[PDB]
Design an enzyme around this catalytic site. Structure first.
Site, mmCIF file in Angstrom:
data_model
loop_
_atom_site.group_PDB
_atom_site.id
_atom_site.type_symbol
_atom_site.label_atom_id
_atom_site.label_comp_id
_atom_site.label_asym_id
_atom_site.label_seq_id
_atom_site.Cartn_x
_atom_site.Cartn_y
_atom_site.Cartn_z
ATOM 1 N N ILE A 18 0.826 -1.213 0.000
ATOM 2 C CA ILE A 18 0.000 0.000 0.000
ATOM 3 C C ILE A 18 0.855 1.256 0.000
ATOM 4 O O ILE A 18 1.667 1.461 0.903
ATOM 5 C CB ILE A 18 -0.942 0.068 1.235
ATOM 6 C CG1 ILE A 18 -1.880 -1.135 1.269
ATOM 7 C CG2 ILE A 18 -1.758 1.359 1.224
ATOM 8 C CD1 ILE A 18 -2.392 -1.461 2.636
ATOM 9 N N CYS A 19 0.650 2.097 -1.008
ATOM 10 C CA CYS A 19 1.266 3.416 -1.047
ATOM 11 C C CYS A 19 0.383 4.457 -0.343
ATOM 12 O O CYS A 19 -0.562 5.000 -0.936
ATOM 13 C CB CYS A 19 1.538 3.833 -2.491
ATOM 14 S SG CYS A 19 2.071 5.559 -2.645
ATOM 15 N N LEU A 20 0.683 4.722 0.925
ATOM 16 C CA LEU A 20 -0.081 5.705 1.683
ATOM 17 C C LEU A 20 0.801 6.541 2.590
ATOM 18 O O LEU A 20 1.673 6.008 3.280
ATOM 19 C CB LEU A 20 -1.206 5.046 2.478
ATOM 20 C CG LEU A 20 -2.280 6.007 2.994
ATOM 21 C CD1 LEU A 20 -2.827 6.910 1.872
ATOM 22 C CD2 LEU A 20 -3.404 5.238 3.666
#
Lengths: 256, 149, 76
Positions: free
Chosen positions: B84-86
């Site tokens: 996840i890119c967050l």
């Protein structure tokens, strides 16, 4: 963005190398130990400053450089005072419970922030009762788990204090951030360096009185560069001195 | 045992739930969290359910939770390996945030179809040059992968 | 033209400067009144750090404007 994960492992390999070398809060050591770091050929400028300061200064307490140095330095300074003046300790417990209620009132995430406060209050209360002694406190102040939980409180009040007086401090912030933006990015997270603006807020929020000794290589006015926070028409002596070498803070004690 | 921050956060996360999200601790490890996020209203991922794995590191809450997607998903924020890119899982993490924050934020990447996407994926550029084709692909992948048993 | 420099210490000072003046000169002038030296100073106008190279007109600073001064104490 796939490369990011592998630099987190660098920022941990480096953080741990710094972590094995020296504790979060060191024991006291003679101020001469600082001069030892400098020799008359390779670092003469610093050696002068170090030597001049040793006329005034007795001991030095090294604080691990981990992005939290300033906050950790202040809290040690405070704790120490509170173990020598009982009233101060009792006064601080009272003003701490206020911060809790001030925090939720300022729209901070309820239970988490409240729990940071509650954990610090129980710390202070156990010091007051006699559960923790001078020696146990310093053991707690060195356990990473405990120490950083306590530190979070001071990070929180520094943030609280800023928001509490946003219209007043906002013009001091830069890169076009708002007070809230600055706080959340710069003050609330761990491992983030302190700047002047944060330094001012913590000191005022804490209700303390501090001298910073600005040890750089430059020619200075007699006795070196220094800075008092808060600077006042009054002439009350500073109750914590910090040593500031470029990019770092340690706690230093006046001679006796 | 555990530090208090986990103990309390579990208790609170069980007696209160988050609408659209099942999130319960592993029976063997209290730091291990199995999460099902049900695909949100009027978004390509309508009608599918997505499993996620959250873990709380030793130093938590002084460092973010580790979070990964198990259920395969066409999204510019989530790659082949489920990563996840967050922002609040890397740079913008604060100890004041919590699991509930991570969940809602992830959910709102779909919810709330977050485009996102001023970053550079092979999925992201496809979503850049044409919303049309990309949105349908993610409806197809919901069909293939997100359901059911 | 007169300008104001507000410092975190609850103090304000005032300076006699020209729009041709470099930020370096403004800093130099603060030194003359306060003592703080140019290289320990950060100046901020409109939420932006003023730069050693440019001049007051480059930043659009007017008569009776307030600049803000913080110190270089960043540390870890």
């Amino acid at each position: 963005l796939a490369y990011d994960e592998a630099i987190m492992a660098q920022q941990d390999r480096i953080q741990q190398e710094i972590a094995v070398q020296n504790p979060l809060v060191a024991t006291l050591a003679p101020f001469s130990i600082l001069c030892a770091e400098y020799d008359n050929e390779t670092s003469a400028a610093f050696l002068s400053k170090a030597t001049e300061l040793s006329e005034v200064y007795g001991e030095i307490r090294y604080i691990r450089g981990d992005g939290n140095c300033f906050y950790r330095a202040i809290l040690v300074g405070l704790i120490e005072i509170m173990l020598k003046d009982r009233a101060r300790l009792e006064k601080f417990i009272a003003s701490s419970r206020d911060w809790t209620r001030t925090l939720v009132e300022l729209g901070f995430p309820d239970w988490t922030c409240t729990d940071f406060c509650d954990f610090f209050i129980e710390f202070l209360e156990k010091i007051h009762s006699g559960v923790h002694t001078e020696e146990a406190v310093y053991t707690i102040l060195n356990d990473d788990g405990s120490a950083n939980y306590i530190l979070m409180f001071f990070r929180l009040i520094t943030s609280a204090f800023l928001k509490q007086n946003s219209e007043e401090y906002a013009p001091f912030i830069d890169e076009g951030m708002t007070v809230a933006q600055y706080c959340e990015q710069e003050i609330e997270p761990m491992w983030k360096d302190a700047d002047h603006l944060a330094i001012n807020s913590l000191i005022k929020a804490a209700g303390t009185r501090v001298r910073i000794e600005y040890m750089d290589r430059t020619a200075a006015p007699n006795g070196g560069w220094h800075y008092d926070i808060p600077s006042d028409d009054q002439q009350i002596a500073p109750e914590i001195t910090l040593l500031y070498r470029p990019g770092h803070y340690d706690v230093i004690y006046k001679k006796d | 045992g555990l530090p208090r921050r986990i103990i309390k956060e579990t208790q609170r996360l069980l007696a209160e739930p988050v609408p659209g999200i099942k999130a319960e601790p592993d029976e063997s490890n209290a730091r291990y969290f199995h999460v099902v996020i049900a695909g949100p209203q009027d978004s390509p991922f309508e009608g599918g359910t997505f499993k996620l794995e959250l873990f709380l590191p030793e130093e938590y809450p002084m460092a973010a939770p580790k979070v990964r997607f198990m259920t395969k998903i066409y999204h510019p924020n989530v790659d082949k390996l489920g990563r996840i890119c967050l922002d609040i899982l890397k740079d913008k993490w604060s100890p004041a945030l919590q699991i509930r924050t991570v969940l809602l934020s992830i959910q709102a990447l779909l919810s709330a179809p977050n485009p996102d996407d001023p970053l550079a994926n092979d999925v992201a550029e496809q979503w850049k040059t044409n919303e049309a084709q990309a949105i349908e692909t993610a409806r197809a992948w919901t069909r293939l992968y997100a359901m059911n048993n | 033209m007169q300008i104001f420099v507000k410092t975190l210490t609850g103090k304000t000072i005032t300076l006699e400067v020209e729009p041709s003046d470099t930020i370096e000169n403004v800093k130099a002038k603060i030194q003359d009144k306060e003592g703080i030296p140019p290289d320990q100073q950060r100046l901020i106008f409109a939420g932006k750090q003023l730069e050693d190279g440019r001049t007051l007109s480059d930043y659009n600073i007017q008569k009776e404007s307030t600049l803000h001064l913080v110190l270089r104490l960043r540390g870890g």
